[PDB]
Amino acid sequence: TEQDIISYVLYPKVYEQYIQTRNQYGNLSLLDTPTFFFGMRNGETVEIEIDKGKRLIIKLETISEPDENGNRTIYYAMNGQARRIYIKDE
Amino acid sequence: LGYAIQCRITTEDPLNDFMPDTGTIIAYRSSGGFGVRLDAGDGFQGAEISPYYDSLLVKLSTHAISFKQAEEKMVRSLREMRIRGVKTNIP
Structure with a gap:
């Protein structure tokens, strides 16, 4: 769009980096601020409003120890569905 | 075409006048x-x-060309059923 264009002209590196982030993590506007800054606590459930009548119900169960790659396993439950996400521990 | 059978799995304990049990399901298969x-x-x-x-x-349902074949499909799936955390009418 036109917004894209002057955005990039106004802010070359910054705009590019925002696109990089968007590809990776999707639309972050919709996360509540505490979740945006701190993530989630064990046993916590979070509602993310996506649209009218549409929301994400995420529960974080536990995080595993870093395996022999520094990859921890996060056990999630998203909209009543067992889910596993592996994160590089920095 | 053939025969079909339904039965329902509930938290009712047959050993106690079919009372509806309350609790967390910790294992469901x-x-x-x-x-x-x-x-x-x-x-x-x-x-x-x-x-x-x-x-x-x-809610469990089975279907095959004969009543006996659908009944043996029903028992097998009832035997494969696994719920712990609450009592069930499966036995």
């Missing part, structure tokens, strides 16, 4: 199979059971 239908309600891996609704864990 069902069957599946050709000519088997599992309509699920309260029975899943996580969340617990409220006492405030007609108890229905899974």
Whole structure:
């Protein structure tokens, strides 16, 4: 769009980096601020409003120890569905 | 075309006048199979059971050309059924 264009002209590196982030993590506007800054606590459930009548119900169960790659396993439950996400521990 | 059988899995304990048990399901594993239908309600891996609704864990149904063949499809899937955390009418 036109917004894209002057955005990039106004802010070359910054705009590019925002696109990089968007590809990776999707639309972050919709996360509540505490979740945006701190993530989630064990046993916590979070509602993310996506649209009218549409929301994400995420529960974080536990995080595993870093395996022999520094990859921890996060056990999630998203909209009543067992889910596993592996994160590089920095 | 053939015969079909339904029965329902509930949190009713046959050893206690079929009282609707309340508690968390900690282990849920069902069957599946050709000519088997599992309509699920309260029975899943996580969340617990409220006492405030007609108890229905899974609605189970089987189908084959003969009554005996559909009955042996029914027992097998009932035997494969595994729910712990609450009592069930499976036995």
